[PDB]
């Protein structure tokens, strides 16, 4: 079936170190459903890691992983990642998307207040880059508040005027 | 009095996800002292964090603490960051190293086997960025062999030619 007439949304990475597979998996799973319904969501690879055994050395590629990881991360034309508890993935993502990322929202949740890392609060520049706090009966505000000073006719048009 | 009729050494950053102070802090105070050893540590920061109460929010400035970090990581000659145990911090320090940095060494443990993160590891490329394992007993060792593929005559020099 020929694709609507209407233009391709936008692309959203959404960060979430996982080492395993766990909660976070099952909320990266629901997060990516917002983000998948907004634009593409390239990390499929993170929580659609759920499926078959976790366990890391887990059949999978870590290299295969972030191979398509840092080329789609490269391919994202918007990206967020979620923080709130210590993780290496998180911090790698959001470092790697402050020199090659641009488009950069961080989330920390002060449910734990476990005060995100003086790195990547730091790194706050509010240039692209920002450490917004949200809990995850919140965090489709948090994306909607920043989605909403964005996605203004990308998320609908019922013109499409000619390329 | 005068320094010495020698050159200055170079300079190395350590990183170590702090997130409070710990072990890691005792180690990172040792880990620090024999790169303090080979030039200057930029990260004086990190390890010298043991002093004063700890708790993140405890009095140091989280922001003050990046800035400098981020100021110095960029001065820093030489950089090898820790890793082990899941880490904010030296996920961004060695993303942004990635980017930023040039000259950047990772350590992970096998004694605990947490498999690096897919991103660092997948990071591989064996051109500045490396992934060595070590554990508290070579930890030195690790250094020591990177470094003996380096610190050729800065270690010392006898001579000293005009310039």
Redesign the interface.
């Known amino acids: 079936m020929a694709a609507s007439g209407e233009q391709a949304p936008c692309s959203v990475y959404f960060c979430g ?3 395993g597979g766990r909660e976070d998996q099952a909320l990266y799973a629901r997060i990516v459903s917002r983000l998948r319904r907004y634009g593409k969501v390239l990390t499929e690879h993170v929580a659609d890691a759920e499926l078959e055994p976790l366990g ?2 887990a059949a999978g590629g ?2 295969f ?3 398509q ?2 080329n789609w991360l490269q391919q994202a034309d918007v990206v967020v990642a979620e ?1 709130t ?16 990322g641009k488009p950069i929202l961080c989330l920390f949740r002060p449910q734990s207040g ?11 520049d509010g240039s692209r880059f920002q450490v917004w706090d949200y809990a995850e009966g919140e965090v489709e505000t948090m994306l909607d508040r920043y989605f909403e000073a964005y996605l203004p006719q990308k998320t609908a048009s019922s013109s499409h005027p000619s390329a």
């Open positions: 170190s996982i080492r890391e050395e870590d290299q992983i972030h191979e990881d840092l923080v508890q210590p993780s290496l993935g998180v911090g790698y993502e959001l470092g790697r998307a402050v020199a090659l476990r005060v995100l890392s003086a790195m990547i609060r730091g790194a706050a």
